[PDB]
């Protein structure tokens, strides 16, 4: 199950959080209902993965985040983490009881992450549009003189 640590933390993602949070009932329904012998639940709390269809917009700030001793993942890295869950040890472990893997690279320990993300984007779009403006005005001054 591709779970998330985002439980409405970022907002403006529709029912994404409602979808991901809901998947976590499968950890309990494995014990309660009568399908434990046919399916094993292996939840994978996937962290910030750069270059995907869902998180391509958020790549420029990833360097900013990583300077809090947090870890963003390449797609090869996050794949490798997830292929770790199909190895024989974790497969024998999922058949005893449901397995929750945290592949979140320490991103839960950042307090109030949406602000810290919006603050990183604004310090970067600002420093762009300022330098763009100062450069285009220093060109128009040079060209007049």
């Amino acid at each position: 199950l591709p779970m998330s640590p985002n439980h409405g933390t970022f907002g403006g993602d529709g029912m994404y959080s409602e979808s991901k949070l809901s998947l976590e009932t499968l950890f309990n329904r494995w014990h309660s209902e009568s399908w434990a012998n046919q399916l094993t639940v292996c939840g994978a709390i996937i962290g910030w993965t750069r270059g995907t269809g869902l998180m391509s917009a958020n790549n420029i700030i990833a360097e900013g985040i990583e300077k809090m001793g947090v870890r963003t993942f390449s797609q090869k890295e996050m794949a490798f983490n997830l292929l770790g869950l199909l190895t024989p040890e974790v497969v024998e472990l999922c058949q005893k009881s449901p397995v929750m893997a945290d592949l979140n690279g320490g991103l839960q320990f950042v307090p109030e992450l949406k602000e810290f993300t919006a603050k990183l984007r604004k310090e970067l779009v600002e420093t762009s549009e300022v330098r763009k403006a100062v450069s285009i005005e220093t060109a128009l001054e040079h060209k007049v003189v």
């Binding site: 809090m68 001793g69 947090v70 320490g106 320990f109 950042v110």
Partner: peptide, 6 residues
């Protein structure tokens, strides 16, 4: 350093 609990 941020992952260190108490």
């Amino acid at each position: 350093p941020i992952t260190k609990e108490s």
